[PDB]
Symmetry: C3
Subunit: 334 residues, 3 copies
């Protein structure tokens, strides 16, 4: 059909791990969904030690925000590169078909903008990331990636084809950083993004991240920023990793229904303890909480989680179920 | 129902790779299954060179023993930390719901014990491991992990929903160790577990294991301890990795039915050469032997297998099938 | 039945990424398919810098050629080790049952040959590789691996059991190399394969490839050797990795139907952005091109792709579809 005849809806994006307001089941016919993202290069402190990198962001955050549309909507993205930035950027949507995901059509120097439209023909959660020719892993591993969820028009379904409706959704972007080191192993600092390049490449080529974080920093999803839920609530956790494999796990829970590689035409895997999200992929896990208290949500390479940063928390409110679990004899000396 | 009205059965655990006696199809209604594990910190020699680490074990073995119950049984574990040990330990069951898998309820100092009960609500093979707050990867990568199998009450089923019955079951626990090195690359020794900590963390943070072994040591599942079978026997191999991805493969065989991420409500993948078990997961492969002789069972990163230790053997007895394979012309010079 | 009564067909293999002529749906009954491979040890230049390794090849190429048969055909391979070579070699087919995949029956010194027959009882794409006892990862990571496709006799099927017919097929073999370094980090050279051994083992034991390439070298599948297709063509890309995990991704496309672990009795995963092929496995992705232009086909660890070599291109001819994607506002300063 003629795209100009479709409804347009403008979305203002929100900061991860929260997600902009949407409807699981499409209440309108196909639409052009308009999004705007402003690229921001900024200093970010990524650990408790104060280590500070030059981050390359969509909309100021690592990860970039979660976009949400329905299958066969059109995504229309205005991408702005303000003149306060120093580098060339673009955007590649794994949800899109053609022109390197959009990257070939969206190359913006500082002081430029562009508008891309694509049809979201396949349902699922998908990575998007910057990918400037010759510079691709540097931008992605500087934080310049996020995700897009393309919901089926009739919402999510279980392995039997019956509805799965979430009460809450969170987006966990997992970021591998490669902070270059001096000779004894200390992390380095730079005034601008551009004198860092060869040593960034050298650091990346070790294939050994120095930091692996959720929402841009060690401990970002803890304390006053812990994820929350109530006993009995159905929660969808979308998880992306644009460059490197991860293996999410909810400590004390499960993934009741998981699309590990993120594509909703496939039946979900049931009852997962842990699931492999390959680098370059978004996945999604659905869980109904059954117990209150603190949960850790981790990459279950536990070194990556508890030493390098890939760990967050849920604080869950509600009633304790002694049938599911109980201390029979509390720790004591006999 | 009232748990006190259920039958109780006590199980004495056996050493991996063997598995305690059980029934595939449940011959009773739901039960409380009582298990006892005694934590043992001990020196273990892990390679042919004589490299010796301070291992942290459940029941004296790396991995800890395989527990077997049925879906909707209750697992009641008495966990004992004798005063001959030096560290704080606990236990986290990926099969369980709530309180960090049990870890929040089972913190035992040396000289203490505790009893935990949980309902095994989801069928599958699952990791369990120690997880003391602040110290988690150190304990797991010191060997303090095992697995639990929660069988469906009506046993295993194929991709069509028909019964799959095994004749033999083995449990292969795969362990990544991170032995710290001096400056030239030699492995270090320690008198106690506790002066090793910072260098253990430094060694872990390389994300490069020094050793990756089955059943606690290089070559443990070979020679007089090779796994065995007969042509025509149906064998289930449960394989866990509590911290790091693996990719099991039976050299000269297949996984006829594989639950790579271990959860029996999902149909198995058929005819696998190799399967990815993500770190933090147990998986299970079912194979009917069709040829006699030696098989290697490996992590098919062949460096991890043949250089770092992740390789064992089967010795299979029976008749050779020349229809399946034959040497037409034996190696010779013409 | 009596094998001597079956038809025999001789196949002359072709160089990857091309595939020898075959039929998707079997036009004959089961056959003995005769293949001949000549081992060649040779110097190969693997990067733009001129780094040169002693490669160990089947039929002169890295990867070795793709063999194609149908389920329940017999593969009869004449393996020749000319006296111009220096090492012992053999072959292990993950498609085969017994004798370590054939490796136990095919050990050929220089100046020897052998003929192996096996029944291809399981449909799928499978790795084959050399595996001489005591030396296995050295040979595999020197390039001595390829793949075999065992088609169902009635061809490929979708998730609903309907036919999937490809117009073109390519075989992408992905190779992790571990070039040893001097003390500052320079790559080394050797006159013969055999003085390299301990340092090859040391380099492998880092688990950090120095190079990860498609078709044997950085940029091999680009320029005049880019893969090609037309808009509307159905393409099967078979991808193997004999030693190490990979995560293929078609930049600007998808895997419409993917057998990530390569076994055709399983329904394919639909609409994949990226898929995990575990080390020791072959996988296959089916895609119908919908847009023209350049695509990159990568391992989506983008460091592995764009820094270490795991990237190739498609050049696709045809009409552009502005409904699927369009630049609304080309990059400009306002
Ligand atoms: Cu960028
Ligand atoms: Cu990408
Ligand atoms: Cu412990
Ligand atoms: Cu865990
Ligand atoms: Cu060889
Ligand atoms: Cu193999």
């Amino acid at each position: 059909v003629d795209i100009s005849t479709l409804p347009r809806v403008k979305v203002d994006l929100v900061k991860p791990p929260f997600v902009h307001a949407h409807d699981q089941v499409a209440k309108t016919g196909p639409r052009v969904v308009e999004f705007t993202m402003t690229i921001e290069e900024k200093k970010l402190v990524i650990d408790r030690e104060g280590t500070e990198i030059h981050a390359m962001t969509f909309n100021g955050s690592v990860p970039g925000p979660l976009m949400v549309v329905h299958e066969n909507d059109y995504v229309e993205l205005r991408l702005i590169n303000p003149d306060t930035n120093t580098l060339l950027h673009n955007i590649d949507f794994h949800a899109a078909t053609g022109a390197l995901g959009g990257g070939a059509l969206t190359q913006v120097n500082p002081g430029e903008e562009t508008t891309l439209r694509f049809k979201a023909t396949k349902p699922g959660v998908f990575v998007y990331h910057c990918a400037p020719e010759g510079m691709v892993p540097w931008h992605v591993t500087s934080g310049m990636n996020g995700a897009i969820m393309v919901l089926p028009r009739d919402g999510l379904k279980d392995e039997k084809g019956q509805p799965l409706t979430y009460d809450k959704i969170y987006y966990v972007g997992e970021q591998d950083f490669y902070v270059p080191k001096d000779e004894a192993g200390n992390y380095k600092k730079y005034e601008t993004p551009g004198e860092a390049y060869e040593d960034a490449v050298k650091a990346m080529r070790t294939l050994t991240p120095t930091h692996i974080v959720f929402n841009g920093a060690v401990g970002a999803l803890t304390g006053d920023h812990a994820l929350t839920a109530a006993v009995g609530e159905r929660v969808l956790v979308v998880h992306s990793q644009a460059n490197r494999d991860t293996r999410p796990h909810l400590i004390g829970g499960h993934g009741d229904y998981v699309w590990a590689t993120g594509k909703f035409r496939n039946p979900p895997d049931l009852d997962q303890e842990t699931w492999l999200i390959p680098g370059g992929t978004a996945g999604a896990a659905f869980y109904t909480f059954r117990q209150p208290g603190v949960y850790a949500y981790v990459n279950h390479n536990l070194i990556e989680a508890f030493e390098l940063g890939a760990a967050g928390h849920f604080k869950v409110t509600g009633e304790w179920n002694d049938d599911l679990m109980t201390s029979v004899v509390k720790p004591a000396s006999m």
